[PDB]
Design a protein around this ligand. Structure first.
Ligand code: MG
Ligand code: MG
Ligand code: ZN
Lengths: 145, 75, 184, 72, 143, 72, 104, 129, 55
RNA sequence: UGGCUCAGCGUGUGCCUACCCUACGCCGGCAGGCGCGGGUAACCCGUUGAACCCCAUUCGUGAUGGGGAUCGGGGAUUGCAAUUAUUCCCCAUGAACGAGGAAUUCCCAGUAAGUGCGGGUCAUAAGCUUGCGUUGAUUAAGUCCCUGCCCUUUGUACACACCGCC
């Protein structure tokens, strides 16, 4: 396809707060933002209607802007409901894909509300212990001394 | 020998270095032209298919795990 | 006539050494289409002497533990390596494989517990040792590398058959000969 | 220097009814010896006979035919 | 001559039949064909825009050479090995919805129907145009 | 069988079937010449390979291999 | 009618089962019956394997028990008023019999 | 503390009190929805009756009387908020304030069954060679 | 006693349901082919049940 | 990621005792749900369309599309009850690990090793075990050196028998 190079090749992209490596292919390039994995990246570029075989550097800035505005607003552009990251939220009930440092914020506030009501999961998150019912006698010592 | 870390979508210097150096030596595989010029290796596959489309090289094996090319014979 | 893999007619190769032409099986009666059979070659001693050489190479290539029954993979690995070799040098791939086996098998070795004396090597142990060294060299050259296993095997065989002190196999052979000479 | 009688007395103190089977006592004493010692020439059999002399030949211990008991 | 489906290579037979089946735009393709994930033992919905046509092709071929198959037979046919984390692998069946949809879409083309027992089988129309595609691809390969 | 086993069964069946057809319906010397030209190339073209498979025994993962043994 | 009936013979003992099948078949054939011979269904082997020790101590030895079931089918082409008495004289306590019509 | 909105799934506590079982099934998550869709048995209803009685017998502007229970698998319903429940550990009855923001949980995850461990010294054979 | 809480925990499915038909123990129970014997009692009675050690 | 193409053991509705194996059609993206049959079985699941392997694609030596721990949210199923997560599914999160020190296990032919599939346990369920096929080798046909065993002669202050006695 591309004979030699695009003349205006953006080597490093800067999308929300993270550096997207422009030498990777586009789906596996934008998977470097939190909240977006391989699966979600592939569906949002299928919805954006860009050719997946081109790398991240030779996308034009309008195409990047389209990819972002359909990444942040997935439900308006027929991303299926069961596909999302934060669906039926415990604070406002609406359905979303947290895709940024906001995902870190959402994880933080979930942890601190469980800690604030002093439920068992919040207590085990407050200590350094395992949460999902594993045995702690033999494994898990790497973080510990 | 720390990291290779260099190349994709080569410049004009690597392009014409390819066009004058690759199609006349015997073993032409994506691996030997990847380690030969600086090419990444998927770019090498694409470039070798494009050269075969022009017709400067000859296809020999064409397996999914190993594709082998060679220079055109001289007579 | 049989012309293994549909090319590379077999009855032109020459095994120079007497000691190893007794134990190398590329000649006209051990001339077969493919390096694959259910041989039952391990039932007695020296029945691997009459197994053809290409099938011994494919057998030793099916090894590091994640490859233990995968023989069809090694058959096409050997096929691709042979095409690469004939394309690189123009010589019969069987002949250069035979020369590699000749040049990589050590001829003197040392053994004891209390490596004390240097002994001589039977001309079946050096065939086995040469095949093992060649396959090990190809395996270690291709491990974390962009080069595929087929042209790694090809360059191992051509460097061993010329003799360069650049194959893994002939480096190991020379080192074994040197250590054996040290306490002869 | 590893202290044999003191370690055996300490193990017998942290036991139900000051009572322990010979096998468990031997296991704990040998693990302690390997984790504190500085001398290395002593063999496994010499350590075993040293332990047998330590338990069967002490007035503070008694052998109830498969076990060791702390007497008062 | 000759020829039939059996005596041609099945890989480019499926490629040619999917090309024919895409070219005549009557195959009904559902709306979620780009978010499917295709049989939950695998990830990364296929590296193809037109996987539905090839799946319909291979379903038509399988119903040609072994009739009476249902959705359970197809979800057994397109099953595979599920790599399962740090636990060892196992066999998982295919997606039932995509098998039902390719079967219903092929019924919409009047080249398969529900037979007298359970399952489906080719019409005379279906085996007719599959043998025509087989003739086309066989003539292409030999010449 | 498998893929390879089916390949070997196919070719053995074809060779043995040609030998039987020649022996029942054309002259015996023709059967002898096709038979011996098959015997000097890969005898399994006419004689079946009898080695089947060995049973697993209850101390390890397979027929011969045994589970890893621990000492201390 | 002329009735087609089928006799099913199952046992854990092979030789006695074949004795019963043979004597019933020859008693039918001497009585001008068209009989389809004994069709041997594939034998069933029930394979309880257990740990051989009452406690959990020792070298992990296992017992391998098995029990084998053998089946035969015999077909007759005359009314039941002779076959009931010809099978009542062939008992051999290890064999368990169902007689059934082809209509069943 | 700036805002006073509870908003469990986008709905705050008042219309979340007067709403029936069959739509707060849709409001909950899967496990609680299955528990409610399936039968909620007699002793659960007895606990709710005791909680309502202790709530309405409480004098205004202080907390109601503590109600003990072994039922540490009860779903915390919106009906239960602001109550005083003693949840069994196996050993003791633990005082739990049913806050508004714990209405999707079990009573068992507010009364811990074990004492969290702080380690002593490894005893004798605790470290081998 | 009394009647409505004596045996009231449901002995449906699980190890509290099933027991050996010889010794009424609950552990090591063989329920294949409807034996419902514990493994020790099965080893005791296997020869005259009809199971033979044969290979 | 797609396409193609091959197994063998064997289980299946129960005294108390409810709990079976499932084809086919429809709904759901999936886990699953709803109808309808068959099977007390060489009869139905089932021609058991298994996985590895095979062919084509993408990746390109980067802790990387290797690896999948840990953790957030949501959906189901079993159950009288799932929180200290039963199991399963989906989207996110993406840790050590770059072939392993001193030591040390198992193994010689359809064997080792790879790879799946049954049974037991089982309401729910296999990283375990017990079986089965499938792909399929390197090395060896020796020795008593190490660890031991058997036999003969020999020494002995041991006989709780060298972990002895002193
Ligand atoms: Mg095995
Ligand atoms: Mg990664
Ligand atoms: Zn019993």
């Amino acid at each position: 396809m591309s004979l030699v190079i695009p003349e205006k090749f953006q080597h490093i992209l800067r999308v929300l707060n993270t550096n997207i490596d422009g030498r990777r292919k586009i789906a596996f390039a934008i998977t470097a933002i939190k909240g977006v994995g391989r699966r979600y990246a592939h569906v949002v570029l299928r919805k954006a209607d860009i050719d997946l075989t081109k790398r991240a550097g030779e996308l034009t800035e309008d195409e990047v802007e389209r990819v972002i505005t359909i990444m942040q607003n997935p439900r308006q552009y027929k991303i299926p409901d069961w596909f999302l990251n934060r669906q039926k939220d415990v604070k406002d009930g609406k359905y979303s894909q947290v895709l940024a440092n906001g995902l870190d914020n959402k994880l933080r506030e979930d942890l601190e509300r469980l800690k604030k009501i002093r439920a068992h999961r919040g207590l085990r998150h407050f200590w350094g212990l395992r949460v999902r019912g594993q045995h702690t006698k033999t494994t898990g010592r790497r973080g510990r001394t | 020998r720390d990291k290779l870390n260099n190349l994709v979508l080569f410049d004009k210097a690597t392009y014409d270095k390819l066009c004058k150096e690759v199609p006349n030596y015997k073993l032409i595989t994506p691996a030997v032209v990847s380690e030969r010029l600086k090419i990444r290796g998927s770019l090498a596959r694409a470039a070798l298919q494009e050269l075969l489309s022009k017709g400067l090289i000859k296809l020999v094996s064409k397996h999914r795990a190993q594709v082998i090319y060679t220079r055109n014979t001289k007579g | 006539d049989i012309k293994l893999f549909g090319k590379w007619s077999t009855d032109d190769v020459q095994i120079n050494d007497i000691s190893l032409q007794d134990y190398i099986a590329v000649k006209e009666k051990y001339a077969k289409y493919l390096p694959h059979s259910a041989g039952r070659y391990a039932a007695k001693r020296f029945r691997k002497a009459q197994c053809p050489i290409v099938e011994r190479l494919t057998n030793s290539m099916m090894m590091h533990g994640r490859n233990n029954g995968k023989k069809l993979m090694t058959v096409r690995i050997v096929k691709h390596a042979f095409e690469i070799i004939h394309l690189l040098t123009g010589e019969n791939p069987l002949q250069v494989l035979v020369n590699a086996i000749i040049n990589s098998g050590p001829r003197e070795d040392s053994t004891r517990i209390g490596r004390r004396q240097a002994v001589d090597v039977s001309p079946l142990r050096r065939v086995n040792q040469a095949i093992w060294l060649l396959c090990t060299g190809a395996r270690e050259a291709a491990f974390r590398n962009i080069k595929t296993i087929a042209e790694c095997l090809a360059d191992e065989l051509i460097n061993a058959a010329k003799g360069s002190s650049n194959s893994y196999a002939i480096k190991k052979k020379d080192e074994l000969e040197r250590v054996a000479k040290s306490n002869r | 220097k590893f202290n044999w009688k003191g370690t055996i007395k300490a193990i017998l103190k942290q036991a139900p009814d000051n009572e322990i089977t010979i096998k468990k006592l031997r296991k704990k004493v040998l693990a302690q010896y390997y984790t504190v010692t500085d001398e290395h020439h002593r063999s496994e059999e010499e350590l075993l006979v040293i332990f047998n002399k330590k338990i069967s030949k002490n007035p503070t211990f008694k052998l109830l035919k498969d076990k060791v008991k702390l007497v008062k | 001559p000759g020829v039939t489906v059996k005596d041609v290579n099945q890989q480019e037979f499926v490629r040619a039949l999917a090309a024919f089946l895409k070219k005549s735009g009557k195959l009904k393709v559902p709306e979620w064909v780009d978010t499917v994930k295709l049989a939950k033992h695998k990830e990364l919905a296929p590296y193809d825009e037109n996987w539905f046509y090839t799946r319909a092709a291979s379903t038509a071929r399988h119903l040609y050479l072994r009739g009476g198959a249902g959705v359970g037979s197809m979800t057994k046919i397109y099953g595979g090995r599920q790599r399962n984390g740090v636990m060892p692998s196992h066999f998982s069946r295919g997606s039932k919805s995509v098998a039902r949809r390719v079967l219903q879409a092929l019924e919409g083309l009047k080249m398969v129907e529900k037979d007298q027992d359970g399952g489906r089988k080719l019409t005379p129309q279906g085996q007719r145009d599959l043998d025509r595609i087989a003739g086309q691809v066989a003539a292409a390969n030999k010449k | 069988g498998g893929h390879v086993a089916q390949i070997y069964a196919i070719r053995q069946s074809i060779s043995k079937a040609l030998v039987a057809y020649y022996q029942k319906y054309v002259d015996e010397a023709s059967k002898k010449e096709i038979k011996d030209i098959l015997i000097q190339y890969d005898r399994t073209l006419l004689v079946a390979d009898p080695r089947r498979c060995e049973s697993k025994k209850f101390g390890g993962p397979g027929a011969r291999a045994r589970y890893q043994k621990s000492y201390r | 009618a002329i009735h087609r009936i089928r006799i099913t013979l199952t046992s854990r003992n092979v030789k006695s089962l074949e004795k019963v099948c043979a004597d019933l078949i020859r008693g039918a054939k001497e009585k001008n019956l068209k009989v389809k011979g004994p069709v041997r269904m594939p034998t069933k082997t029930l394979r309880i394997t257990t740990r051989k020790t009452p406690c959990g101590e020792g070298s992990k030895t296992w017992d391998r028990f098995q029990m084998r079931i053998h089946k035969r089918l015999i077909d007759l082409h005359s009314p039941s008023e002779i076959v009931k008495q010809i099978t009542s004289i062939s008992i051999e306590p290890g064999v368990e019999v169902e007689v059934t019509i082809a209509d069943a | 503390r700036t805002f006073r909105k509870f908003t469990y799934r986008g709905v705050d506590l008042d219309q979340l009190l007067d709403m029936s079982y069959e739509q707060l099934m849709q409001l909950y998550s899967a496990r609680q929805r299955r528990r409610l869709n399936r039968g909620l048995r007699r002793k659960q209803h007895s606990l709710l009756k005791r909680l309502r009685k202790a709530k309405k017998e409480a004098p205004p502007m202080e907390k109601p009387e503590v109600v003990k229970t072994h039922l540490r698998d009860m779903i915390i319903l919106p009906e239960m908020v602001g109550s005083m429940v003693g949840v069994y550990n196996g050993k003791t009855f633990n005082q739990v304030e049913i806050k508004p923001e714990m209405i999707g949980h079990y009573l068992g995850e507010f009364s811990i069954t074990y004492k969290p461990v702080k380690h002593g010294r490894p005893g004798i054979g605790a470290t081998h060679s | 006693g009394h009647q409505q809480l004596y045996w009231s925990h449901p002995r449906k499915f699980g190890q509290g349901s099933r027991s050996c038909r010889v010794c009424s123990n609950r552990h090591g129970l063989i329920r294949k082919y409807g034996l419902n014997m514990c493994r020790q009692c099965f080893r005791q009675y296997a020869k005259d049940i009809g199971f033979i050690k044969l290979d």
